[PDB]
Amino acid sequence: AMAKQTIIVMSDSHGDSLIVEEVRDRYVGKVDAVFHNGDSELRPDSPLWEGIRVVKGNMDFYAGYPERLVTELGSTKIIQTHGHLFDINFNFQKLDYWAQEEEAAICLYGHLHVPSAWLEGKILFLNPGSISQPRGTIRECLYARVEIDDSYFKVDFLTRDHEVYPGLSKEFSR
Ligand SMILES: [Cl-]
Ligand SMILES: [Cl-]
Ligand SMILES: [Mn+2]
Ligand SMILES: [Mn+2]
């Protein structure tokens, strides 16, 4: 039985560097990985990115962010993209095709500023929400925690004070 993993995922921070630093500082070295799914509006050479896996958003104009990132975490293959290059506002068919060709455990995306967690195929798709500019029905700034083991993905959405926001948590069996 694999040892349990915990990942921290955020996105669409939009020029708020204190929140990125705060989340880095809180979690780097205490969880298995920390992810940012883009639209930070920060420089890729920022020291705030030490310990964090970050991809390019459409509102990231500086050279040096990757469009896609594959992170293999033990037996867990995580893929990560902003989403704009997959036309996710149209639908998720292009994103899901890529996730299937990669045979990902987890597919991380941003762009929509809407928190979501669903299982399609055996693949968890997660948008952590926007940590600065929430959209849709939930007007609270959010990021996400995923707990991973052989039996379950557990997803909680967390506020900027690092508390679980109720009514959004999901548990998926694998
Ligand atoms: Cl799009
Ligand atoms: Cl946008
Ligand atoms: Mn954005
Ligand atoms: Mn975007």
Side-chain angles (χ1 to χ4, degrees), residues 7-14 16-28 33-40 42 48-55 80-82 108-111 113 126-132 141-146 156-160 162:
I7 66 168
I8 297 296
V9 189
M10 64 179 152
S11 195
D12 292 271
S13 45
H14 284 285
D16 185 338
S17 54
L18 278 183
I19 202 64
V20 168
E21 183 181 20
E22 184 170 357
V23 163
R24 182 211 45 206
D25 283 357
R26 188 178 175 80
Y27 292 113
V28 170
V34 179
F35 300 86
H36 189 302
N37 302 339
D39 269 8
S40 60
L42 306 183
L48 299 181
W49 296 127
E50 298 159 329
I52 301 175
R53 304 283 273 172
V54 56
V55 289
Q80 188 188 8
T81 197
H82 191 65
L108 295 179
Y109 71 101
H111 191 54
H113 298 210
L126 175 71
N127 189 318
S130 172
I131 202 168
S132 299
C141 292
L142 293 171
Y143 65 101
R145 181 180 61 204
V146 187
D156 288 297
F157 294 88
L158 275 44
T159 71
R160 284 173 63 114
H162 317 295

Side-chain angles (χ1 to χ4, degrees), residues 83-90 111-112:
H84 64 295
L85 301 169
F86 290 84
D87 301 313
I88 62 175
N89 274 293
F90 177 41
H111 191 54
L112 305 179

Side-chain angles (χ1 to χ4, degrees), residues 30-95:
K30 300 181 164 198
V31 295
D32 299 77
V34 179
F35 300 86
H36 189 302
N37 302 339
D39 269 8
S40 60
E41 303 181 19
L42 306 183
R43 288 157 68 73
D45 65 8
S46 187
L48 299 181
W49 296 127
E50 298 159 329
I52 301 175
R53 304 283 273 172
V54 56
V55 289
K56 191 202 181 299
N58 62 305
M59 295 307 182
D60 290 324
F61 298 117
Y62 313 105
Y65 289 117
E67 286 175 5
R68 311 172 182 190
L69 210 48
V70 178
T71 301
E72 321 229 4
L73 224 54
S75 67
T76 303
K77 180 172 185 172
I78 301 169
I79 73 176
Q80 188 188 8
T81 197
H82 191 65
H84 64 295
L85 301 169
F86 290 84
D87 301 313
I88 62 175
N89 274 293
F90 177 41
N91 56 40
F92 292 100
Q93 292 191 311
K94 289 184 199 103
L95 190 67

